[model samples]
Target: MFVNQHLCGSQLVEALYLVCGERGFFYTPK
Candidate 1:
């Protein structure tokens, strides 16, 4: 179950990267 959740989060991050660019990662911790 944890593995599935982890993969889902990865895919979500990838999707966000595509839409928002890599810089989005830097701002995410705020």
Candidate 2:
């Protein structure tokens, strides 16, 4: 599905981080 889009890899990851961070979805290993 993403094969045709001009993807911005770093931007995509950054956005994912923001979304995950906002949702408290990050893993914190202890």
Candidate 3:
């Protein structure tokens, strides 16, 4: 379950990077 969630989050970041450029930044939960 956690792995799935992590993959999803990573995908989101990749998507955002594509849309917002590779330099895009976001807050990540620690």
lDDT of each: 0.55, 0.54, 0.62
Best model number under lDDT: 3
lDDT of 2 by residue, 1-30 (tens): 343455465655555576677675433333
Candidate 3: which stretches are off by over 4 Å? Answer: 1-7, 28-30
lDDT of 2: 0.54
Per-candidate TM-score against the hidden true structure: 0.40, 0.42, 0.42
Model 1, range 1-30, lDDT digits (tens) per residue? 333455345676666576677467532534
RMSD of candidate 3 to the true fold? 6.3
Each model's Cα RMSD: 6.7, 6.7, 6.3
Candidate 3, lDDT over the whole model: 0.62
Worst 10 residues of 2 by lDDT: 21-30
- Model 1: which ten-residue window has the lowest total lDDT? 1-10
Relative to the true structure, candidate 3 reaches a TM of: 0.42
Error of 2 at 14 (Å): 0.1
Q: Is candidate 1 or candidate 3 better by lDDT?
A: 3
